[PDB]
Every structure is written in C-alpha cells, then in structure tokens.
Ligand binder design. Structure first.
Ligand SMILES: CCCC[C@H]1CN2CCc3cc(OC)c(OC)cc3[C@@H]2C[C@@H]1N
Ligand SMILES: CCCC[C@H]1CN2CCc3cc(OC)c(OC)cc3[C@@H]2C[C@@H]1N
Ligand SMILES: *[C@@H]1O[C@H](CO)[C@@H](O)[C@H](O)[C@H]1NC(C)=O
Ligand SMILES: *[C@@H]1O[C@H](CO)[C@@H](O)[C@H](O)[C@H]1NC(C)=O
Ligand SMILES: *[C@@H]1O[C@H](CO)[C@@H](O)[C@H](O)[C@H]1NC(C)=O
Ligand SMILES: *[C@@H]1O[C@H](CO)[C@@H](O)[C@H](O)[C@H]1NC(C)=O
Ligand SMILES: *[C@@H]1O[C@H](CO)[C@@H](O)[C@H](O)[C@H]1NC(C)=O
Ligand SMILES: *[C@@H]1O[C@H](CO)[C@@H](O)[C@H](O)[C@H]1NC(C)=O
Ligand SMILES: *[C@@H]1O[C@H](CO)[C@@H](O)[C@H](O)[C@H]1NC(C)=O
Ligand SMILES: *[C@@H]1O[C@H](CO)[C@@H](O)[C@H](O)[C@H]1NC(C)=O
Lengths: 728, 728
C-alpha cells in the first residue's frame, strides 16, 4: 500500500540526506553554518556562538557563493560571481571583510576574474592567481607584490595547474603551498607551449549566431605533455617596487633524464619541503627532501636522502604516489606503500635511513592516514570482518604497533560499516561520518579516551519519511572465480521473492582501482529501478578493482579492456544461474570507464546481454589523456604497448553489436572524454550496417549534470530499459 | 505481382532506371559513353563509331574520373585524383592527351590540386584555377600565362566562387566565362576578408588522434557578405615578359550604393557581355549591357541600355533573376519575367528600347527557355491540361506569337507528362527525355519537321522486372481551399482499397518555389513504405510553392514558417476526411527545409500528427546563410524583419513537442545547414523536459550520402515509422 520510490522522487530530490559539514579551526572548535549563520562550536561542551551574523551581507549587493576565514581570525574572504571551468578550476570575484570593524576593505582589492586565492596557514597573509601570475598580500588593505611575470593564457601557468594536472595529478586547480610559518610561498609552474589542443564547439544560448570553438591544451596518449618547474619565495622579504626573488628547486637527475611529473608537495618543517616526482613511465618515483640554507639562502636536496619507490607488478600508488605524513620534528614520516604480499599498508620512514618499517600487515589494506600525534597514528582500513568495501577508523600506539584499536567498528555495527573522519588540530577531537548501510550518522568524539560526545545529525527526519515508502534493500556478498573471492552487490526490489525471476541490470564502472560493491547507503537511479520497476540492479568488482591488493588490482596492467571486461560477463553468467534472475532480460550500463566496459561487453558476442547503455564512453585509449592512460597502458609506440592500444577499441568489435540493443549517449562539450570518442563508435557501427540508438547532449560535459539535462538523460534511459524489459 | 518493393531494393538498387546522357559536340553529332568506351553518334542517320577506346589509358596508372574533349577535337582532358569539396566544388589532377598523335603531354602540365579547368568554347585554349589564381594556356604543351596574383586561400577568390556564391548564386564553382571567339576571358573575383567563419569538428578516420577543425567563410543572415569585382582579359594579347592586363567592369551606380551581388554573366556576342546585379535587399536588379571599344581597349556599359527588374509582392526571379537568351546579333534577348497577373512568362527585349513584349501569357508558367533560332523560340512550360506538375516542350513561331505548337504533349500522353530537352548547337536536333508518370523514355528528333528519329532508351528491361513486383500507384490531384486549387500527390500501396484505413506519412519539403506534387517517376523510400509496409505517402504543395504564379509563391514573403506550415497541417486534415486514412496514424517527415517545416508542424500543438522525423533542419533563420535567407526574410534587424525572425524558430515551440514522438537526425559535418541548428533544437526540448529520439551521423554533410550512412539513416527511419504505426 505505501508508495514506491519513483523516478520523479530521485529526480526532484524528494527524500534528502542531511549533512553536517564542519571546518575545524583549532584543537577544540569548528565552524558550522546553521540557518546560514556561520557559527562556532566548542567541541568539549557543545556550546555555540554566532561567528558571522546571517543578516550581515543582505545589502552587500551580490549572492555570496562561498567564504573563507583567515586562520588567525581577523578577516573573512567573500567569494562571489563564481564561474566554473573544469572539475576543480573556477574563476571568481572576492571582497574582504574586516571583522574587528563592520567594514569591507575598499582599497587594493583582489581583482575580478581571480583564478585562485589562499590565506597563509597562520595570520592573515594572502596569495592569489590572476591572469596566470601569482600575487601576494601581506595585509588585506595594502598593495600586492607581484611574484611572477611570465603568466600567459593556455601557455604559462604559475601557481595554478593546467588541464592534466588539475584532473589527474593534483585533483585541484591550485598549485600553491605556503609554509607553516607563512614565510615561504611554494609554487609550481607549468609550460604547455607544445601541448596540442583538443577543439570543439560550444553552441551556447540561441542568441549566439556563430558557434564558438573551445580550445584546450590537452595532451592525448603519447603526445607532448606539459613540463613543470618548482619554486620557493621568501614572503617576509618583499619590496614595494623591487622584483621578488624566486628560488628554483630542480628535479633530481634521475627524472631530468626524460619526461616526468611533479606529483606531490608537502612541507615538513618551516625549513624543509618534500617533493615527490614521477617518471612519464609511471614505474619510478622519487621523494626529494629539501632543506633551507641559512647561509646561502637556497634549497639543497641531498641525493643520499632521496626515497625511491618502484613497482615491478604495475604502477606506483593507487592513482598517484601516496602522501607522506611527517612527525612534528620533520625527521620521519609515514606513507602507504604496497608490502611484499602486494597489500597497501603503513610504512615508517626515517630520513637519512634507507628501508622503511611496516607497522600494519595482513590481507586487507589501509585506505588513508588521517591524523598523527606523538602517541598515535590514526588510519582508515577495510580490515573489519574481511569486507573490502567497508571502512573503519583505527588507532595504533606508536610504543607498540601490535597495540591497535578499532574506534568505529562497534559504535553501531548494523547501521554503520562505512566511516570517514575529520580530526581537529592536534587530534583532540574527531567527527566521525557513517555513510551506510543505514542512514548516514554524524557524531563527535573526544580523543583522550575515545568517548562519544554527542550526535550531530542522525537523519531522523529522513527515517520518518522513508518508513512510508517501499524501499529496496541491498545485498553485499561474494562469488568465487577461479579460486578467488570477488564481491558484488544487488539492489533488490521490496518484498523480494527468490521463487520469482527478476530482470537484472548490471551497473558497471570497473576502472583501475575502483570499487562498486560496498556498504554505503545511496538514493539513486537504481533505487528507483528496483522500487518501482522491480528490477535487480547489480554491480561487481572484478580483476582490476581496488582495496584488495595488487594481485587483483594490477591484473589488468598494460591491458585495459581485458580481464575487467571478461569478469563482468562471467559475473552476469553467474547471476543468471541464481534461481531468481530471468536470463532473457539481463542488461548492462555505465558511464565513462563504465561506458567503455559496457561497450566492450556489448561487443564481445557473449550472448548474455540483451541490451546496454553507454554514457560518455572512452572508445580508444589513444583518444584519452596521457597521465591516466599511460599509467595503465604505457606508451602507444610499437616499441612499447601499441598493439593492445589497437586491440582494445570499441570500434573493432563493431560487428558484434548487431546481436544487441545499444543506446549511446555523450555530451558535446565534454572536455574530459571527448565527444570524438563516441563519434568514432557510431561511425564504426554505421560502416558495418548496425542499428542502434543515440543521444547527444548539447553543451553538456562529462557529468551531464545541469539540472534539466540530468532529468532528461535519466528519463531517456528509463524509457529504454523499461522497453528492453517489456515493462509498461 | 507477387514479390514486394523492398527496403534493401531501394538501398541496393535492385531495379535501375536506365539513362541516356549524351553530350552534343556540334549541330549533328553527340558523344556517348557506353561502358567506358566513348562513342560518337550522327544524329541525322544514327550511325556511330568509337571515338575513344576504353583501353587507351590502361597503362595510365591512375583511375580516370572524367574527361573533357576540346571543341576542335584535337585534344582531351583526363580528370583524376578527384577530391570533393562542397556541392559543386572539388579539386583534381589533369593530364592532356593529344589525339592526332597518341601522346600524353609531358611539357607544362596542369598542376596538382587544380580547382577548375575549362576549354575555350571554340578551339583548344585552356583556362584553369590553382591556389585561387587564374592561369591560361594557348596550347596544351606550352607554358601557361598567369592572369592574377592576388589569390589567397579562404580570402581572395579569382575565377571561382566562395561558399555562398557557389551554393546560392551560381550553383557552380566556376566563375570564368570565355567569349564565343575565345578571345576574351571574363572572370569574377570575390573577397571574403571580413566574412565570419563557421567552425565545426571533423573527426576523420579512427587513426586521427586529434579532431580537425574545419573553418569556412559563411555569412549567416545579416552578417558581412563577400564583395565582388568583375574583370575581362584579352587572351590574344598575352606575353611572357609583360603581365596580363585585366580590365575591370564596375557595377552600376545603382548597385554601388549599398551591398550587392553579381548574379548572372552571359556573353551576347564576341564584343558584348551581359551582367545582372542584385541588391542585398533582393527586390531590385539591374541588367547591364557592355561593349568592347576597339580603340580604347576598354568596356563601356551605357546606363541607358540598362534594364531594371523590381518585384512589388516579393523577391526577384525564382531562386534568382532569370537568365537572358540573346538573338544571334546581340541586339535583343528573351527572358522570363513575372507578368502583371503574377505569372512567369517570356518577354522580348530590344536592347535600347523601353519595356518588353510578352510573347506568352496565361494562367500557367514557362519553366525555361531551351533554344533560340531565327524562326523559333523553344521553351518548356506547364500549360498542358492545366497541370502545374507536368512539363512539355513548346515551339513559338517568331513571326506570329499566336502560332504555338506543343512538341511533346501528344507523343506518349499516358506515359509521358514531364519532359526535359537538350538541343544540339544551332538546334537542328533535339533529345527528348520524359520522366513520368511512366518509365523514362529518351528520344532523338530533327528540328526541321519536328520528326521522331529513333528511340534512344525505353527502359524495356526495367519494365519487365517491375511487372513481377507489387508496385505502388501514384495519385496526382488537387483540393480546393479558399477559391484556390492546391495540388497533392499520393503514393498508394498495391491493391489499394478505398474501403480500408491506411496509415499516412506526409512527406514534406515546402520551401519557397518548391514542388512536391508532380508527374515524375521515382524509385525511392516512399516506394518501399507503400509497397511493403502499406503506408500511404502524401505530399502537398501549398502556399509558398511554385509554378502557379506569385499569389501562391510570394504568399510567404518575409513570413517563413507560417502559411507553408499551416497549409501542410490543413492538408493532412483534408486527407482524413477522405475515408481511407486512419487518423490515429498520420506522420510527417522532412530534410532541410522539409526538416524545418516538419518540426514546425510537430510543434504547432495541432494534435493532428502522432509522430515525425526531421533530418538536417533549419531551426533558426539567423543560423542559415545570407543570400537565401534574406531573399525571403529581409534583414534580422528591428528596423526590417527581426520580430518574425524570432517568432519563426523551432526552439520556441519546444513545449508542444510533449504531444508527439519526434526523431531528429543531423550530420556533424554539414557545412550548409550547420549541426548547430539541430543542437539548438535538442537543447530546447531538454530545457523544457520533453523526451525525443536523436541520431547524429559523424562526418556526413547535408546529403548524408555516403552509401553506408544512407543505408543507415533510412534503415533507422524505417524502424521509427514502423513502431510509430504499430507495424511489424
Ligand atoms: C575514462 C574516464 C576516467 C576518469 C577519471 C576517474 N577518476 C576517478 C577516481 C580518481 C581518484 C583520484 O584520486 C583519489 C584521482 O587522482 C588523480 C583520479 C581519479 C580518476 C581520474 C580520471 N580522470
Ligand atoms: C533551408 C535549406 C535549403 C537550401 C537550398 C534549397 N535549394 C533548393 C532550391 C534551389 C534551386 C536553385 O535553382 C533552381 C538554386 O540555385 C542556386 C538553389 C536552390 C536552393 C539552394 C539552397 N541551398
Ligand atoms: C562556550 O561556553 C563557554 C562558557 O561560557 C565560553 O567561554 C565559550 O566562549 C563558549 N564558546 C562558544 C563558541 O560559544
Ligand atoms: C537568521 O538567523 C536567525 C536566528 O536563528 C534564524 O532564525 C533566521 O531564520 C535566519 N534568517 C535567514 C536570513 O535565514
Ligand atoms: C569588478 O566587478 C565590479 C562589477 O562587476 C566592478 O564594479 C569593479 O570595479 C570591478 N573591479 C573590482 C571590484 O576589482
Ligand atoms: C616554455 O617552454 C617553451 C619550450 O616549449 C619555451 O619556448 C619558453 O621559453 C618556455 N617559457 C617559460 C616561461 O618557461
Ligand atoms: C556515319 O556514316 C557516314 C557515312 O558512312 C560516315 O562517313 C560518318 O563518318 C559516320 N559517322 C559516325 C559517327 O559513325
Ligand atoms: C602531381 O603529383 C604527382 C605525385 O605527386 C606527380 O607525379 C606530379 O609530378 C605532380 N605535379 C604535377 C602533375 O603537376
Ligand atoms: C579585400 O577586402 C579587404 C577588406 O575591405 C580589403 O582591405 C582588401 O584589400 C581586399 N583585397 C582585395 C585583393 O581586393
Ligand atoms: C606581374 O604583375 C603583378 C601585378 O600586376 C606583380 O605583382 C608581379 O610581381 C609582376 N611581375 C612582373 C614579371 O612584372
């Protein structure tokens, strides 16, 4: 009798997850916005005050898009006129509000169209990027000092990243790193002069008579990539008219030998910086430890003090060399590295000593190091109950590595099995965030004795609303494939009955180091497919998937479009043979890597799938960017991996699509996986005389996330699946 | 007759129409290519021999695309390495083969990537265009003389047209016109400096890592058009030492005022050239008559023999100002003009005298003037039986305009109601070519006592094959709307039965001066829809259509997207009265203008139609080109016609589409109706939440005509109509 979770429920966000986003600002207080007052909370006692009144900025004259408060609390950055670029990059105007006064500063304002801004970690110093050059402000109302002069659109980038670096190396537009003193400003410079450009049309509003051509430096696989330089500027010694001096730190000879990348920047102490560098062949990376010299005024990186990571089995790190977490003095640090068994665990490194010491071990993996104090290192792993898709927070005592406590496993075992955490400064308190399988639960804690302080948001409101609807349930379990455990999940319709046969949709991603079977609670298309259409939606993590060691993750090294595709077919075969799935109605779908796999599956000739939907698929590894592709496939030269680059396109399997109903969708302004990719898929289908369905989304990019497009594509695919499954 | 006309038959051409394409080379011989042998024929007696054996160039090494034989029969041009540009333009390599000898010419060869070649009209001089400049050859083996030096790719065009001029004005690449002597070479020169560029992606073979951006100068409505200059060179007075002397002919002062076009160039005599010009507001045109001054060396155009044409109710001419046919002495010419009742007839003009004399009159129109001799003007009209969609050859005795014979009406009246003609030089012989309603029949005749000589091709073969197929029939008829006749044609399934209800597809074009209802015999898609799928396929010629005078044709002046659209809806309504149509299954489709109308109909909210298909549609007139659009729509400024430009888009009707099932298809490399036009439609249906189907064809242009793409779209449209009509 209750209503079912409908397509329109998902689309209009009728059942919302409540959140509790805070920003720790000290060792015992955080900022939180409530009824859009920016408040401060005292962690120990829960009491709150009003940092910045909701009312303030009513007469400001513009919609304020985000804010940032100076660390040593005398000012606040008001971000407005936000215009978005790529995944992380955006441009914006900024005002500055002086708090010890009811006043916006009116002089020496940060310019409009600013590319990036950042407070120093302490005090109130400002660093920004405009027209691709760096600028520094010592005080909010004074003139800025110009640090670089070489900035040029699409060509020279100072302190911000170019397209590849934003997307694949740093996951940020930013390329600035202040010292903990705020004395030193470090920045990377990127040169893209000889990097080719991907070009495409943007139509814009009807009123535009002629289409625009968007042109972006984008190094496709095996092209000339950008180069990078790294610099450091003393921010305390600057002159109103005399040009600032930037000291350059050079990459180690073992990288300058060829094409390479800056991969990580991390200050250790006020006088030591850590640089991780990675060879274009992503086999070899070097951590450089560089110290400031009182005498010379320069930075020396002792060769004997370098740290090396190699991989014989695949590439380095999960998507990148892991982050190093330094002890307070800067003499040692902790880092995730693959152990001799191939499982990623925490290793202890001392700076002028060579090997490192494993402090965690076993048939699971550490996912991230989240905080370090002199008594404790806190990390998240999937150790609990051997479930690779779970997540908990653990604690190690550094005086005995065997002394390990799990801090989150038993807090709410049935409801919470997927945590993330956010510690105050010095880790005096931590916010725990549970993401499923029940409703998300946010809690606060004290670290001295790991006591539960409160409950910050339990989503009770959601709970009450959901009780009135036929929600689906989720199964997490595993199958065996050739002596190995591989997990899967199913989203089962309500009042599921195993004596009936249900149509099955295989939801697939399957990119390297991905995980599609886990314990998090989601409200999404699948929810609707199952609750209203009684469709089983299934996902499976096969060879190539992550968090279960290298044997499985690297099985696909130098070989995309291979074991990961086979394994999705085999999982389906095995789902077929469960008494409850009708083998006449099995479909497959996915987005991005997911579309490539889905396409490669549909073109395999397996006979197992009736129909599928590929959204924004890669169709040919030579079409995608250099950093991601080569990491998994090497270079597409005959000397290296050209044959497989050629044997693993969707075009080559064009003939087999005659055996299936295929819907191909792609947005036309996709700057990440270019429309070209699906354009070649269709040309290939056409050359061979195969019918299929298509949908381009004008001006949409890789996420197809504009509100109306979003509603449309999911509307379009629901029609498609419904009809594939003879469902009215 | 048992078997059916099948989709594959259409697509694979199981049933070929034979043709008889001949090339006259004198008053009494023609050449004909049978197999690959070139044959020469005698028209009077009908004997024939082999001019060029198919074997001659077996060791040429390159596949020969076409040939052109010098008018004095001494040499032949071989065209190879043919690369297609737009509709008429293309590049190619050329060799010249000396006939009296059997020698290829090795000296001073025509260059690669040549853009246009043409023999003089009498002898064997050559004029070609390479890198946008004109070169002349007196003798095939001698060095060429460079006539222009200003040529610049995409900017200066000497002797060839820019994109608009090629497609909308001359319907040709060529912009060279030899004088009948061969003495003078007259050529146009276009300057596209300020014309904006349409840009679009072209993806090419799979192997291209980066898509190429194609950029073409193309004035969209109301943008900066190209400019034109006209020159005439004396080709008898060229030297190697001195440069060629080009004499410019300026346009009339009444054209120089504002923006204008060069519409027609026609040589009257060895020393007289006729030029027509047209004002950007294409409602006024001026014919200029220019003579060579033997002493001066110049060309003078006496403002006094200027002839003016103005239209009160609309534009000038059908798709342009009609062409003049000059009597041999040059002093007078005949030309089709709209008369005072609004019908297009032949008018006689004497060069220095006012007005002109109409030699034909009546409620019908002359379609073309086909030949002129001392005693007779030959022309084609649609007078016979008052059928606007019929065509016939007529003869008028010049010494008494009331003496008008129909030369074609009674030859084969039940089989032939649509002819075209081709006359030999001096018109002593003519080939008739009938196109329907029966199978095409090609016949040769002598002009003396308009006698039949021979039957050239009667398609007997095709006849018998077709006897064994259940072919559809064709109903050609009319409906009365106000006090006016509007013609439709129906394509009826075999064994038609006026008692049963058939589903109907309205096949629409409906752009200005178009005619969809006629007596032509066609084997096409509609053929299949009727014969195999038992679908009636109807076309209708309403307001804005042509060959019925101006009341009908100009009714849509400055109002595109109105009466032509309404009228198609009304036609389908009328078809429903007629009791053999199922009004729950009426559909509509079109290409180009047809696409535009279909989409405008589908969005009218009319309820009449269930579904439709739009291929390569214009969606906004500001997107299409300047010459065509401004012809019917004026300028898109507030002071001229901007409101209707904005009330006539497909985008604005978007909400209405929820009422129907729509399929939109467009080639990504359409340089004519830019993909932009459908990209904007798709985004508008998306912004308003209307579902629909789509299909882009990568790298195809406005014709989407490569064999595979053609097979695929028609396959895909078949599936669409079939399911729209609940037909298996
Ligand atoms: C064919 C399309 C594939 C697309 C992207 C997939 N994402 C998601 C996971 C991830 C996670 C990263 O750090 C955690 C990360 O750090 C660079 C990159 C990525 C990749 C980057 C790649 N751009
Ligand atoms: C909205 C798209 C429609 C575009 C095309 C329509 N055709 C058909 C009729 C026609 C007939 C002509 O001579 C008879 C002609 O001579 C230049 C041009 C045309 C136009 C050219 C214009 N390219
Ligand atoms: C919390 O309460 C204590 C006692 O009044 C006070 O000192 C503190 O400032 C309060 N904190 C906030 C952020 O309101
Ligand atoms: C402003 O803050 C008050 C104080 O609680 C809150 O109740 C009110 O709803 C907020 N007003 C706005 C602008 O949302
Ligand atoms: C930036 O923007 C505002 C309006 O957009 C303008 O008035 C101002 O002068 C510009 N310069 C600033 C604030 O840096
Ligand atoms: C960028 O590198 C190019 C070499 O491709 C060089 O010409 C240029 O000087 C470099 N610019 C800077 C500022 O490093
Ligand atoms: C036709 O016959 C005449 C007389 O035999 C011959 O001279 C002439 O060359 C022939 N022409 C052709 C093209 O066969
Ligand atoms: C044209 O190209 C072909 C191959 O490049 C060559 O044989 C010839 O010499 C070229 N130049 C000409 C024909 O003018
Ligand atoms: C073409 O037109 C441009 C723009 O008016 C002008 O400056 C240029 O000289 C012209 N070129 C020629 C060769 O006519
Ligand atoms: C020939 O004439 C053109 C312009 O008329 C000039 O640009 C070219 O250099 C000339 N060369 C000679 C041979 O006089």
């Amino acid at each position: 009798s209750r209503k079912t979770y409908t397509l329109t429920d998902y689309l209009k966000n009728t059942y919302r997850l409540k959140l509790y986003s805070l920003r720790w600002i000290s060792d015992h207080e955080y900022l939180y916005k409530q009824e859009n007052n920016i408040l401060v909370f005292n962690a120990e006692y829960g009491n709150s005050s009003v940092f910045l009144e909701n009312s303030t900025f009513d007469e400001f004259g513009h919609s304020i898009n985000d804010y940032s408060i100076s660390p040593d609390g005398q000012f606040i950055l008001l971000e407005y006129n936000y215009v978005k670029q790529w995944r992380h990059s955006y441009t914006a105007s900024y005002d500055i509000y002086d708090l010890n006064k009811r006043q916006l500063i009116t002089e020496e304002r940060i310019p409009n169209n600013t590319q990036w801004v950042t407070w120093s970690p302490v005090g109130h110093k400002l660093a920004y990027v405009w027209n691709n050059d760096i600028y520094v402000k010592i005080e909010p109302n004074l003139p800025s000092y110009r640090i670089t002069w070489t900035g040029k659109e699409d060509i020279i980038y100072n302190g911000i990243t170019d397209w590849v670096y934003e997307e694949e190396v740093f996951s940020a537009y930013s390329a600035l790193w202040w010292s903990p003193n705020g004395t030193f400003l470090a920045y990377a410079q990127f040169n893209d002069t000889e990097v080719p450009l991907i070009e495409y049309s943007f139509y814009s509003d009807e009123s535009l008579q002629y289409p625009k051509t968007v042109r972006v430096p984008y190094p496709k696989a095996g092209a000339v990539n950008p180069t990078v330089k790294f610099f450091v500027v003393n921010t305390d010694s600057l002159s109103s008219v005399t040009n600032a001096t930037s000291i350059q730190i050079t990459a180690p000879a073992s990288m300058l030998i060829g094409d390479h990348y800056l991969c990580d920047v991390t200050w250790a102490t006020q006088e030591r910086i850590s640089l991780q560098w990675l060879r274009r062949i992503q086999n070899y990376s070097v951590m450089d430890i560089c110290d400031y010299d009182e005498s010379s005024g320069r930075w020396n990186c002792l060769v004997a003090r370098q740290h090396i990571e190699m991989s014989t089995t695949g590439w380095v790190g999960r998507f990148r060399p892991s982050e190093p977490h330094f002890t307070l003095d800067g003499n040692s640090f902790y880092k995730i590295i693959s152990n001799e068994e191939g499982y990623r665990h925490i290793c202890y490194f001392q700076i002028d000593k060579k090997d490192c010491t494993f402090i965690t071990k076993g048939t699971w993996e550490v996912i991230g190091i989240e905080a370090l104090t002199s008594d404790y290192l806190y990390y998240i792993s999937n150790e609990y109950k051997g479930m690779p898709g779970g997540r908990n927070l653990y604690k190690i005592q550094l005086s005995d590595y065997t002394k390990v406590t799990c801090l989150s496993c038993e807090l709410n075992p049935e409801r919470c099995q997927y945590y993330s955490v956010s510690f105050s400064k010095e880790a005096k308190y931590y916010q725990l965030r549970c993401s499923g399988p029940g409703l998300p639960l946010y809690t606060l804690h004290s670290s001295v004795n790991d006591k539960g302080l409160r409950v910050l948001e339990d989503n009770s409101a959601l709970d009450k609303m959901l009780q009135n609807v036929q929600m689906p349930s989720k199964k997490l379990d595993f199958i065996i494939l050739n002596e190995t455990k591989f997990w899967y999940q199913m989203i089962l319709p309500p009042h599921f009955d195993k004596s009936k046969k249900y149509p099955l949709l295989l939801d697939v991603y399957a990119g390297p180091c991905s995980q599609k079977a886990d314990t998090v609670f989601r409200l999404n298309w699948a929810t609707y497919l199952a609750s209203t259409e009684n469709i089983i939606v299934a996902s499976f993590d096969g060879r190539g998937s992550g968090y279960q060691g290298d044997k499985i993750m690297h099985a696909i090294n130098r070989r995309l479009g291979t074991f990961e595709v086979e394994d999705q077919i085999e999982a389906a075969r095995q789902f077929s043979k469960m008494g409850f799935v009708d083998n006449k109605r099995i479909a497959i779908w996915g987005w991005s890597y997911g579309g490539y796999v889905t396409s490669m599956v549909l073109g395999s000739g397996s006979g197992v799938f009736k129909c599928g939907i590929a959204v924004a698929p890669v169709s040919r590894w030579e079409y995608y960017d250099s950093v991601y592709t080569e990491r998994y496939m090497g270079l597409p030269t005959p000397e290296d991996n050209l044959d497989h680059y050629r044997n693993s396109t969707v075009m080559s399997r064009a003939e087999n699509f005659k055996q299936v109903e295929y819907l191909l969708i792609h947005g036309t302004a996709d700057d990440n996986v270019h429309f070209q990719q699906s354009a070649q898929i269709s040309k290939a289908l056409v050359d061979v005389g195969v019918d299929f369905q298509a949908m381009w989304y004008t001006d949409e990019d890789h996420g197809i996330a504009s509100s109306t497009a979003h509603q449309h594509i999911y509307t379009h695919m629901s029609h498609f699946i419904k009809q594939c499954f003879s469902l009215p």
